[PDB]
């Protein structure tokens, strides 16, 4: 599951799931959501209490949306295959468990502001400041804990499943092929976690969603 800001015909919305199969992010899972304007200024945003929508005034002037989601704890008993969203300390038969974090960035107006790192624990930062055409490559920097992540594996969600990931270079930089229309890039990491009874792994996913000219 990814958590992302989908740029729809009705305005941006917060989704959790997969591009063709998604549901709104539950409010209790949103740690932060905000926009950045074309001059780099942070714009606050919350979904409306009746209709669940992000504010039009912010959406219309956003350069990029940023989403930070705590997807909580996951585990499953020995002998099962599907994880449930409960910590291993409450699931008899579980011995491992994950704390799952999800981040998303959606670019809606290209310019210098979108190249500024936002401080997401795992982040894809565009190195291009121009709206990409299909067929171009978009250079990106992958960051982890605020520093380049050499060898990060970037997945093109629109490409066939069987496509090898784009591997970031020694500087954590990659030249990602741009496809037509709306597209999503993802990077994930799963790492050991010490000091949490409820999980021995921390899983982090991040994405960059954008639309080609
Ligand atoms: Ni999933």
Author numbering: 1 to 213
Please share excerpts from the published article on this structure:
Based on this evidence, we selected a DUF4198 protein from Ideonella sakaiensis (WP_082368692.1, “IsDUF4198”) for recombinant expression. At a 1:1 protein:metal molar ratio, the greatest thermal stabilisation was observed with Ni2+(ΔTm = + 7.0 °C), followed by Zn2+ (+ 4.6 °C), Co2+ (+ 4.0 °C) and Cu2+ (− 0.2 °C). The IsDUF4198 protein was co-crystallised with Ni²⁺ and its structure resolved at 1.4 Å resolution using molecular replacement. The IsDUF4198 structure features a cleft measuring ~ 12 × 20 Å, which houses the metal-binding site. Unlike the canonical T-shaped histidine brace seen in LPMOs, the three nitrogen donors in IsDUF4198 form a facially capping arrangement around the Ni²⁺ ion. This coordination geometry likely underlies the protein’s preference for Ni²⁺ over Cu²⁺—a notable inversion of the Irving–Williams series.
We report the method of signal strapping, where sequences of N-terminal signal peptides artificially appended with a histidine residue at their C-terminus are used to bootstrap a proteomic search. Structural and spectroscopic analyses confirmed that these proteins bind transition metals (Cu²⁺ or Ni²⁺) via N-terminal histidines.
